């Protein structure tokens, strides 16, 4: 090796031989604190990323007449107002392979973890024609998040791009982490792109993924806040181009964006710098086009293409809890329904803070399994009745038995819903948990003990009645033998819980 | 360097200067202006280039006073992005944004200068040991624990707290942390900064006798400065901390107050700079600039820079972009609320909204987590019963919910602290209480076991035993 190190150099220096192509090249008029209004790049395709003389890669978005106004994908300190900047035949692609599994990357698809260097001889163009209607299919198979709230009331099927909206600090990153952590027994490649979150929170999330072991299959496309506006703009597109490759090669994926508020805010920055006319809330003209172009490539394909599915799950941080602002109403018009985390429900102990109300899903019971199609009906109906009767709870003074028992079962139902941090509940266990909550086999216990009793019941059942696992995991229906097995198991567990 | 300037236009603080075509400084490259003062020739006002306009002229915001500059003055560029003297020299001295001493003692040495605007630390080396801190405040040590080696946000309205709270926190921790302290007066009123300087030189932190013995190094770019200085005082404090985290390898605790000024000055210069206006009126590059400050503060495997920014939520606009992008960067946010200072409960930290990434049970303790959960749920119940209390009479709600309302009242009074630095406003002496004593106090308070004391016996009280004694004193002076 002692001189084989330079004998390796001989390979390249004798291989490459300089065909004399034409590089589109122009001077730099103006470097505008994140934008570089270079001049003269004539036949440069809109989006064809430019390369300066100091190696500062940047995309050429704004193609004006006398000055192609490019934006910089790195720091722009060293541009020197006249340095000949050369176009590059790349049209903003990223390399992509299954070797990207586990390593956290920037939007350049360059690993920022450190623990290797990904090789990838398959390149996917970042912005791409999304799956058309000939390709897309209806949502068949569900995607368990591990949450009784967002897996019984309102499903998330593979292909349906549900939306995690809510007040800041409510659990959006927590519900996303719960989904990616549950998605271990399954096969999904849970690409988690983080846009404008601080570096330290992404370190916490990546080490949480590592501690729970889910980091084997989840490309965490990290983008720190001090990354320039272009890279925070490009991160969702980068993760979309990775999950798109994995979806096209038959593998069900799940891309979880982080803070589309922050992503469209970075686009707002780069476009207001690039002198594009602003609309509502000073967001530029194509915010809705932007969010759709990256969020409408989240589809479940057909057998003609491979049956794989990208199943988005964006996160939109809305302040003061409003649906009215520009970006949340845009993303709510795009996404197939949404969910609603709320700060007051969160500080009222209910975790996850799923709003039992407005959080509708456009798919409905077409996603869930037959066991859920059975039991979630009663759960949804009883939560509807309890939420209507919620005002009567503090004033129920010896009212009739129907109202009293229904309201008491609702008061137990919300405690059934609230589940601990980062606790993944696979489909079988939450099925029996919902059944226990809805058909009354926990009415004798008070409000507090529902949680402890249900955790102990899930432990006892999943460890001592493995036939329930066979039935639910295998036959995927809540048939009478499973119903009787669960009834007897719950009864014996209530006896041993009276024995305490 | 040597590139003579010939300043073309001076439009407010933003001045743009037309260098020769070949020799042109880079972005964020300092420009010392060889100019005359109002009286007397020698006067060097520093300008940092913001962008190049392409007519051979660059736009440069002026760090010092803008008046007196003429069109056509010779200026030269340093070639280095505004080097600031730091290290073993910067201790004890109130520092200007330019890199100068302000406290009229001897000038510092420049043997350990450093560029102010540098690259952010890479994710490859990032030290994250999740650990709690015992600051001293009852509520913020219980309800929203603070992550040492991490960032902390003292959000609030205009005058709710966040500076008396910062003074109390520094009075606590300046002796506790063996690492140095750095105070960045980003756009805070000059008299409060001088109060802080007097308090530091009295409390031994400065130790004016041997100025190399201070545990602190101040940086003041306070209110009476052109918007250049408030655009870079935060980065001056950051450069001092980054030196204390690169070289001395010690956990430096930096304080920035009114970090919102680091966005307001950016707005006031961006509007002039030709950059179009963003939402409600700040700069377009709000997110990138705010991140360029608040990302350099990370524990980076040689030390841990714990920082406490006191964001200024303008007019209690919790949705305003200048705090809305800081809520993303800040670990242990503490949203102080004017509505809770209305009834006198100081500090007026919201028990609900003041939340932390350190209220996870494996990080804080299961008992701590369960008591914080019960306190926050009780306060949420009180906020949801506020409307029923407000209109339909206090008694017409439920009787168990009346127990919850009395418990919530006792809690939201008990989480008031008599500070040492706020002894002048309360009249009562300051009381310091650790996390354990207030934990045991909240247990017995919310547990309904001592739900018989009077309410004012819990308000402005250091501890639970102090509350029990105050109930005795109050019931005695009631009849007597």
């Amino acid at each position: 090796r002692a001189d084989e190190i330079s004998k390796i150099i001989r390979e390249r220096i004798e291989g490459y031989n300089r065909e004399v192509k034409v590089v589109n090249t122009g001077t730099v008029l103006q470097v505008g604190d994140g934008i570089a209004r270079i001049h003269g790049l004539d036949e440069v395709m809109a989006g064809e990323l430019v390369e300066f003389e100091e190696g500062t890669i940047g995309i050429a978005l704004n193609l004006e007449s006398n000055n192609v106004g490019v934006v910089l994908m790195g720091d722009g300190l060293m541009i020197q107002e006249g340095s000949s900047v050369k176009a590059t035949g790349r049209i903003a692609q990223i390399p992509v392979s299954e070797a990207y599994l586990g390593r956290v990357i920037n939007a350049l698809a360059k690993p920022i973890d450190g623990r290797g260097e990904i090789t990838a001889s398959e390149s996917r163009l970042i912005e791409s024609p999304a799956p058309g209607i000939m390709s897309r299919r209806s949502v068949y198979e569900p995607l368990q998040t591990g949450l009784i709230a967002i897996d019984a009331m309102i499903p998330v099927g593979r292909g349906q791009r549900e939306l995690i909206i809510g007040d800041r600090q409510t659990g959006k990153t927590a519900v996303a982490t719960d989904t990616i952590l549950n998605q271990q027994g399954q096969n999904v490649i849970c690409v988690y792109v983080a846009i404008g979150q601080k570096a330290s929170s992404v370190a916490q999330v990546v080490t949480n993924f590592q501690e729970r072991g889910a980091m084997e299959y989840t490309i965490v496309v990290a983008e720190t806040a001090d990354s320039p506006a272009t890279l925070q703009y490009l991160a969702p597109y980068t993760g979309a181009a990775l999950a798109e490759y994995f979806m096209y090669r038959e593998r069900h994926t799940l891309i979880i964006y982080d803070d589309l508020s922050k992503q469209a805010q970075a686009y707002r920055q780069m476009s207001l710098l690039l002198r594009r006319p602003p609309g509502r809330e000073a967001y530029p003209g194509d915010v809705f086009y932007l969010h759709s172009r990256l969020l409408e490539r989240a589809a479940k394909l057909s057998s003609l293409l491979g049956e794989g599915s990208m199943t988005a799950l964006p996160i939109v941080e809305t302040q003061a809890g409003d649906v009215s602002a520009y970006i949340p109403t845009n993303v709510i018009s795009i996404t197939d329904g949404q969910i609603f985390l709320s700060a007051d429900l969160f500080n009222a102990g209910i975790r996850p803070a799923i709003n039992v109300g407005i959080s509708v899903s456009r798919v409905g019971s077409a996603a869930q399994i037959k066991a859920m199609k059975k039991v979630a009906g009663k759960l949804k109906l009883e939560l509807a009745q309890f939420a209507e009767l919620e005002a009567f709870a503090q004033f129920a003074s010896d009212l009739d038995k129907a109202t009293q028992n229904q309201l008491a079962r609702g008061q137990r139902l919300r405690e059934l819903l609230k589940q601990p941090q980062s606790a993944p509940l696979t489909v079988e266990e939450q099925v029996m948990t919902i059944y226990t909550g809805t058909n009354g086999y926990l009415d004798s216990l008070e409000l507090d003990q529902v949680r402890k009793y249900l955790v102990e019941l899930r432990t006892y059942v999943k460890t001592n009645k493995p036939e329930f696992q066979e039935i639910i995991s295998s036959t995927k229906t809540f048939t009478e033998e499973a119903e009787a097995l669960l009834k007897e198991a719950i009864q014996e567990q209530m006896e041993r819980f009276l024995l305490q | 360097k040597k590139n003579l300037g010939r300043i073309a236009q001076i439009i407010g603080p933003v001045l743009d200067v037309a260098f020769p075509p070949g020799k042109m400084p880079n972005i964020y490259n300092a420009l010392i202006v060889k100019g005359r003062d109002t009286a007397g020739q020698p006067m060097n006002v520093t300008c940092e280039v913001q962008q190049l306009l392409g007519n051979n002229r660059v736009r440069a915001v002026a760090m010092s006073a803008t008046d007196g500059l003429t069109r056509g003055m010779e200026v030269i560029d340093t070639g280095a992005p505004l080097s600031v003297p730091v290290g073993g020299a910067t201790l004890g001295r109130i520092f200007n944004v330019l890199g100068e001493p302000v406290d009229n003692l001897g000038p510092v040495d420049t043997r350990t200068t450093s560029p102010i605007h540098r690259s952010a630390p890479a994710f490859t080396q990032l030290d994250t040991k999740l650990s709690i801190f015992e600051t001293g405040i009852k509520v913020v040590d219980l309800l929203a624990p603070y992550r040492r080696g991490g960032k902390i946000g003292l959000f609030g309205g205009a005058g709710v707290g966040k500076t008396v709270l910062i003074m109390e926190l520094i009075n606590n921790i300046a002796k506790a942390h063996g690492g140095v302290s750095v105070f960045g007066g980003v756009g805070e009123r000059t008299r409060e900064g001088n109060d802080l300087y007097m308090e530091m030189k009295e409390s031994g932190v400065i130790n004016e006798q041997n100025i190399a013995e201070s545990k602190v190094a101040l940086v003041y770019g306070q209110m009476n400065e052109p918007p250049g200085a408030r655009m870079r005082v935060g980065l001056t404090a950051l450069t001092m901390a980054e030196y204390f985290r690169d070289v001395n390898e010690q956990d430096v605790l930096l304080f920035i107050d009114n970090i919102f000024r680091f966005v307001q000055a950016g707005s006031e210069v961006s509007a002039l700079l030709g950059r179009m206006p963003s939402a409600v009126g700040y700069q377009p590059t709000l997110s990138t600039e705010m991140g360029s400050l608040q990302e350099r503060i990370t524990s980076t495997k040689e030390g841990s820079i714990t920082s406490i920014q006191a964001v200024y939520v303008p007019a209690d606009d919790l949705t305003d972009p200048a705090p809305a992008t800081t809520f993303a960067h800040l670990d242990a946010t503490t949203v102080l609320s004017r509505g809770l200072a209305a009834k006198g409960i100081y500090p007026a930290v919201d028990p609900l909204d003041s939340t932390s990434t350190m209220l996870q049970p494996r990080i804080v303790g299961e008992e701590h987590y369960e008591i914080a959960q019960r306190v926050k749920e009780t306060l949420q119940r009180y906020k949801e019963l506020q409307d029923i209390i407000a209109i339909l009479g206090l008694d017409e709600l439920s009787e168990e919910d009346r127990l919850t309302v009395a418990r919530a009242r006792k809690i939201e009074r008990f989480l008031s602290q008599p500070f040492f630095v706020a002894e002048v406003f309360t009249g009562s002496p300051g009381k310091y209480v650790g996390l354990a004593e207030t934990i045991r106090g909240f247990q017995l308070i919310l547990s309904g076991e001592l739900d018989s004391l009077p309410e004012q016996a819990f308000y402005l009280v250091g501890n639970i035993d102090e509350a029990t004694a105050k109930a005795m004193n109050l019931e005695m002076e009631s009849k007597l």
Binding site: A320, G321 | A315, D316, D317, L318
Partner: peptide
């Protein structure tokens, strides 16, 4: 937003 937010509070 301290103007719209107050009215949202009163509506709720």
């Amino acid at each position: 937003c301290a103007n719209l937010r107050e009215l949202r509070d009163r509506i709720g």
